[PDB]
Design a protein around this ligand. Structure first.
Ligand code: EVP
Ligand code: EVP
Lengths: 760, 760
DNA sequence: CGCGCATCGTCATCCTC
DNA sequence: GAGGATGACGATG
DNA sequence: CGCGCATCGTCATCCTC
DNA sequence: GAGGATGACGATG
């Protein structure tokens, strides 16, 4: 009785023989954990140790079809390794002895990712074998997350709140050399030996008491308890907000040694952190509409200038190095590719430039090449969207004592209304279609005036399809068809979410031949597709055309598309989630949040210009004094020079003062009055400085004269000019994409008016 | 008759039916070529087009065992796709019609890599079916390498000599916008349409006339014609040297349209370039002993400072970006890993620092983690090995109008004698064992004195094994065994090339049990292996120990290792290959090449110090003149100031003069006399400058007084101090690697003296 | 260096007793 | 006792 | 994101009629 | 003619 199916399994010495109850099956996530286990178990033993590497997410068997259960080979092989039988109750001790193993130990990192794997495993086990949750069948192995060392003294920490309490309870901080442990590649064999030297500290079992815990086990895995999970997340968010406001430290686990672990606290304390993290990283906020990955990428791009092009794979490492990215490399490259996509039906305004094959509009749009095959370059719109002067507005986080990206940004327009926010998280989701960019400026101007803004319509770049709204939060999108002759027909325009391969396989194949129930509808079809436009030389029987007209062209060819927008939940500026009703309310909230910052920017600009103004004034006064002549330069000591500078009414460095009043808002400094070359002593330099000192005075007087209003329009004027330039470049690209072919012929076309089923 | 084995094959419409002679099978290297073909053939057609992607190198069937032929599944599937039969002659037209295809078109890039694939394919076909080389069975598809564009005017170029002739024949260079085409990811569908628009230009067939060409076909594929290939490479190298000396341009192919292609020119012109490139990139030179990949990595590392650590995957992109690396990413990361390995038996002096798991000495040393899992940091020895002042000695290449790495370097010691040169190329190879680093300094000192240097012995870091040389260019290496008791035995030291897993599987398993012919030799064994040391608690019958002693301990346990060093072929400073005889001759040649550069460095340093010396002298004179006072600073025009500076004997910028005399070796410049701040007018600055101007004079007088000799020893003194510091750090690491265990017990040990078989 | 299984939740079709 | 067969190998496809 | 086949040539074992 | 079943989906394992 031995396993020979997969070679990756570490067959134990007693796996299949005597002492089946003492056989231990270890599940290791990822693949580096397998190497760590092979390197570490060489000292402890090999008899009661069978290691199996894990791939990743586990298929949820609680809600799946019978065909779906037999799909993943690995899940099926788990039974072959263990020996489970669905139609047999494992209640008697002999039934437990029958199994090839007696205990299952799973090990994960201190991150929240392992919580999902543990929950999926508990679901897979309890869904068919609840009675096995009381016979010491499951246990857990843990790892450290951070270690401090000073003078050969090490301390173990397994929780971030534990580390925070250690910092709050110990004096002389920044003395213990700190070392983070984000992944498995950091640990070595010498550390694994110490890890396996103490089993009572890491090898911790579980405990089950009362059926009520099973309800919690079902809480995160029931499709009928969505509102219950919503209330659960709401209670947790309220508790966290109250604790942060009161400043009381939260609770954590693994403070001292533990033998068992209750399921109720296990669900209420560990998996909830993964749920909160997934929700924070999945859906963007309403202020800037940017996800944390896009935020890190854009911040790293802002860090440099990037005048020339740059590789994607090379940029991903630079982003991960400074943004503290700890989610592999594939996800970041995928996010960069999604930011790079700008074809029709995907986005309306990108932050990069299309260089290479970023996926066409024919086959899924995901047929792009390797990130190193393709190149990229920053766009010119980002400079106007995020002005650099806004760097002094938001407060950055402090991780690793490093200046990192902020929590959000302040754009000139809501990005959710221009690129769409499609986020799927726990408790809620977000799906907002695109709109027109030209109407946004008119709406903002009308709102600045104080009039009721007109209702908007979902628009797309390079899309001539009309959209009519019958019921609120519901939209119908149809394409355009051209009838050249009573026999020939051509589809002019396709609606959103229409891929060439999918539409072909789902429409042309059933219509071409006679299916099991439908006669062959079409007689001929051709696909002269260009890079962006489509062509359909399709022939049809004239008699069948009348029936198609009576039924409906959009109905027969399936050109109609219905969408509903109800999940208007976004992260507020504070951090809460509120289900919204209309777009205009979101625009008004953004307008108020933006109005709050005109005074802040004005206060930051006011006085800052005055600082350099006074500095130049003092420099000019020093030059005039030198022209008159009182300060002897004949090897005078610096002490007398500083004394004269103080006695003659010369202030210190204003830039130093503004820098000092930034963290929380010897003696005098006069380096700037002595770091000036002799070129200042020339006539031309003095003449140009005499007006350079007034060039700043003009702007200072204008700022003292101008109001906080009338600035948004002046800022938008340059943006509209740049947008017209970008549209001219797009028209030039269309001229480049012009082969020299003839224009589309005019033909009869109609749009069907679907009866309103009064849905919702 | 259809193919259903692999889904990757693009089944043609006529593949298996009528018109078998007209069926065309296309072989595409890599995987991007398959996407390019799918994107391009959509316009031309799909009936007579069957595309198959290629994996890479092809197994050589001309010299392989019968078992080896049936190993690669892809090679076997090639027959299933085509329909070849080994025991059937395809001479009659009906036999050609029987095959599923009539023509084979292969396409590769303009690089030399495709030449190897084409040669392997020609070998695979001709080895069993020569008669098929005369019936239009094979053809070729080509791609561009570079394109120029200006004012909507494009020109195609397929050869680097063609591009050189175009540059030499056309005026107004740097006007046509150039675009390189190194790989397949650069080309787009719009370019593929133009590529397939002209078949007569790219689709070129072949021609065979006379059996003599077959000899050339065998020349690059015969294991008995090694000397013939050596003469062939020698003739080509001599011809290239003569053509470069005479300045005559070489010959190239694809100048005009061609219908056929002779095999003789095909072998003598295209594959020879791949052979030369592989030979240039495989074996390092004798001057620095660094391969081009190591050279690019080290140059990129020199470009930056790298005070902190850095990732390997992140560094690889930065190396590829500046060094013009066009060989993927895996090879560069593998080269970095090889540079990072410093364990016993691999290297003696690395250029990096071990951070992470770089592979242990237990399982092949190739069990390291992902390049992003591990970190790296530059060592401190590189600063002394390659002084920055040597940057003005060698002339860098000019690729893409960019300053790139040089062709070689000038180290203080020959790297081949400290890290080994193991290169395998066409025509020759190189395998040089390691030696002792301490003896190199003594040998160099003795050579500088003028005495005959003592013979050296191959040494290794942390290796106590003795080596005795009986015959020249031959070495015997043995380990050490400890006999604790008449029954117990332990192996103290293992010889070079001894891996724990391999030695165990090849020695302990046959000795433990009774094999088909040998009784069980050992009775027990234990493996208490540490990170570096080994332990063997092995028991043996006392009676069998006497027989083992009579036969030989090194002989029975296979502890002896024999190696011969005969391939002493290295690239000379000129570029030629000369088979060397002894190491001392190599040391003398390196000593002469190094002596040639003392005068060059002295000439570069002489005058350069004088330039800043005169500059500081002029600055001090200007300060003294200002103390006396003649130059009025009252808004005087710059023209009068320049006139006074000229009339008072003040020279221009010497740094500008040295910069001008570097490429081939308004009016005056006085910016440095006016770019000085007022701090120079202070007493302390003047007092410190009065001695700073003489600090350079002291070194200048010392250089004028010192000789070109006595500099190498002074340079080596700091290097020996740093080497002692590095060895102290290694001893500190050994103290870190000290668990606290007891020392190895003293025991009887012996080294066998093998009889000399007088080999070679 | 291309190959491949899933998660959270929301919704458009869609088909049969 | 000697010649064909088996792997060691290091950059690249 | 780990999985896997080869090339150029040189040489150490190595084993059987 | 209505309710359970099937995929669309976007960041990560
Ligand atoms: C191999 O070893 C491990 C794999 C993984 C998974 C994974 C799992 C897979 C799988 C593929 C992958 C792969 O992701 C895939 O990338 C693809 C690239 O973008 C587009 C094309 O499509 C993506 C797939 O949607 C995604 O699934 C890995 C990337 O990083 C991960 O986290 C992924 O196909 C089969 O099951 C986790 C591990 O432990 C931490 C492992 O040890
Ligand atoms: C998948 O598609 C393609 C693959 C290739 C080969 C390749 C071929 C392989 C194969 C693996 C590989 C892989 O290299 C492997 O890296 C490994 C990593 O370092 C150590 C561990 O061991 C190396 C292998 O020795 C090497 O073989 C590719 C890396 O870049 C290449 O050039 C390699 O295993 C099976 O056959 C070329 C192509 O066309 C351009 C392709 O389209």
């Amino acid at each position: 009785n031995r396993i020979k199916g997969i070679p990756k399994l570490d067959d134990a010495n007693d796996a299949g023989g005597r002492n089946s109850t003492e056989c231990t099956l270890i599940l290791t996530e990822g693949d580096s954990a397998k190497t760590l286990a092979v390197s570490g178990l060489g000292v402890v033993g090999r008899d009661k140790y069978g290691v199996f590497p894990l791939r990743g997410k586990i298929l949820n068997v609680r809600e799946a079809s019978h065909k779906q259960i037999m799909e993943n080979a690995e899940i099926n092989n788990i039974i072959k390794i263990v020996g489970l039988q669905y139609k047999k109750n494992y209640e008697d001790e002999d039934s437990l002895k029958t199994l090839r193993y007696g205990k299952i130990m799973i090990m994960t990192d201190q991150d929240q990712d392992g919580s999902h794997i543990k929950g999926l495993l508990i679901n897979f086990i309890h869904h068919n074998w609840p009675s096995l949750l009381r016979h010491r069948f499951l246990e857990e192995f843990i790892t450290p997350i951070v270690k401090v060392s000073k003078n050969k003294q090490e301390m173990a920490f397994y929780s971030l709140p534990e580390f925070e309490e250690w910092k709050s309870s110990t004096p002389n901080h920044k003395k213990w050399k700190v070392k983070y442990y984000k992944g498995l590649g950091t640990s070595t064999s010498k550390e694994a030996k110490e890890y396996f030297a103490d089993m009572k500290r890491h090898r911790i079992q579980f405990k089950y008491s009362g059926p009520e815990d099973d309800a919690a086990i079902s809480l995160a895995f029931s499709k009928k308890q969505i509102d219950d999970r919503k209330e659960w997340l709401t209670n947790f968010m309220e508790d966290r907000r109250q604790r942060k406001l009161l400043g009381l430290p939260e609770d954590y686990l693994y403070g001292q040694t533990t033998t068992y672990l209750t399921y109720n606290d296990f669900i209420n304390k560990e998996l909830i952190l993964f749920s909160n993290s997934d929700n924070e990283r999945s859906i963007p906020s309403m202020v800037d509409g940017l996800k944390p990955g896009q935020r890190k990428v854009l911040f790293t791009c802002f860090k440099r200038n990037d005048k020339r092009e740059v590789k994607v794979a090379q940029l991903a490492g630079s982003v991960a190095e400074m943004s503290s990215y700890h989610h592999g490399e594939m996800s970041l490259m995928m996010t960069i590719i999604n930011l790079a996509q700008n074809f029709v039906g995907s986005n309306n305004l990108n932050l990069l430039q299309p260089i290479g094959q970023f996926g066409t509009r024919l086959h899924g749009g995901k047929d792009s090449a390797s990130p190193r095959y393709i190149f990229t370059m920053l766009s010119s719109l980002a400079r106007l969207l995020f002005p650099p002067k806004d760097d002094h507005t938001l407060k950055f986080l402090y991780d690793d004592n490093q200046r990192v990206e902020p929590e959000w940004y302040i754009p000139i327009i809501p990005m959710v209304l221009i690129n769409g926010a499609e986020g799927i998280g726990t408790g809620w989701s977000c799906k907002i279609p695109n709109f027109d960019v030209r109407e946004i400026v008119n709406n903002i101007r009308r709102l600045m005036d104080g009039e009721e803004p007109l209702p908007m319509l979902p628009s797309y770049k390079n899309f001539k399809g009309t959209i009519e709204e019958l019921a609120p939060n519901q939209y119908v999108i149809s394409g355009e068809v051209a009838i050249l002759n009573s026999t020939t027909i051509e589809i002019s325009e396709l609606p959103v979410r229409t891929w060439t391969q999918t539409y072909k396989e789902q429409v042309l194949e059933p219509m071409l031949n006679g299916t099991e129930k439908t006669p062959p509808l079409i007689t001929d079809y051709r696909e002269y597709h260009t890079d962006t436009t489509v062509k359909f030389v399709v022939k049809m029987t004239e008699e069948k055309l009348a029936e198609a007209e009576r039924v409906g062209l959009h109905k027969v060819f399936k050109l109609q598309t219905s969408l509903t927008c109800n999940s208007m939940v976004l992260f507020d500026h504070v951090g809460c989630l509120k289900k919204y009703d209309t777009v205009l309310d979101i625009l008004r909230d953004f307008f108020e949040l933006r109005l709050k910052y005109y005074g802040l920017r004005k206060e930051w600009l006011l006085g800052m210009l005055g600082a350099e103004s006074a500095k130049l004034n003092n420099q000019a006064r020093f030059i005039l004094e030198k022209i008159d002549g009182k300060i002897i330069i004949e090897n005078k000591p610096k002490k007398e020079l500083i004394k004269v500078l103080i006695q003659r009414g010369y202030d210190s460095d204003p830039v130093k003062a503004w820098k000092e009043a930034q963290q929380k808002v010897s003696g005098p400094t006069f380096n700037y009055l002595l770091d000036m070359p002799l070129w200042y002593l020339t006539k031309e330099k003095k003449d140009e400085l005499c007006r350079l000192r007034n060039e700043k005075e003009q702007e200072l007087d204008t700022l003292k004269r101008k109001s906080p209003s009338d600035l948004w329009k002046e800022d938008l004027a340059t943006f509209i000019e740049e947008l017209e330039a970008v549209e001219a470049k797009e028209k030039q690209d269309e001229q480049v994409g012009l082969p020299g072919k003839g224009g589309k012929a005019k033909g009869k076309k109609t749009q069907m008016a679907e009866v309103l089923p009064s849905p919702r």
